[PDB]
Amino acid sequence: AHVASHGLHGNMTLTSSEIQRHITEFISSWQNHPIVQAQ
């Protein structure tokens, strides 16, 4: 689980740090939104 947390999904040998940080910010943004969840 720790190495999977390291990599994008496992390895990090197929993702530039540019796109990697972009998608990390994207996922962190959509993390807790309520789309992923009186008479």
Add this chain to the structure above:
Amino acid sequence: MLQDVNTVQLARVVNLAVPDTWMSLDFDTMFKHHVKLLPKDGRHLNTDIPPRMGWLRAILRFLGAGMAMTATGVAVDIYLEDIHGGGRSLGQRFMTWMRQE
């Protein structure tokens, strides 16, 4: 006006010189041929360096040669391994410092 100023700024920001004890040895060919910035099994997408940041190869050759000369035994071929962040990110880190002068 010639000799664009991306080199003087780094030369003024960083203080990395050849120590005293290396004066009797042949460190020049060690810098040139035996500290390789292309890692052993090819490209990595992390060790890539942007085209307009050539000064970073200097610091990389520093760190390779020092880490190789520190250990006992024989001097060995040392290859670049991985840069956390990335080539461009580390270059931007050095470049803000060079700019702030």
Add this chain to the structure above:
Amino acid sequence: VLLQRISPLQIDPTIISNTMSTVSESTTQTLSPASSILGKLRPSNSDFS
């Protein structure tokens, strides 16, 4: 086990590395087939049983 004891073959997964390190590809590019297969393949003589 006894196949390992008898067989003359010997799997050394540095052939793959030495053949993939000679690939010519640029650096201003966000994809690299050599690195991709080296990651997918992971040559290591840990478990070739």
Add this chain to the structure above:
RNA sequence: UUUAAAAAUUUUAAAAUAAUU
């Protein structure tokens, strides 16, 4: 049709350590 070579200058003025004339 895309990439890239990037400058190797000085003699660097002073203060400390070491070697020498």
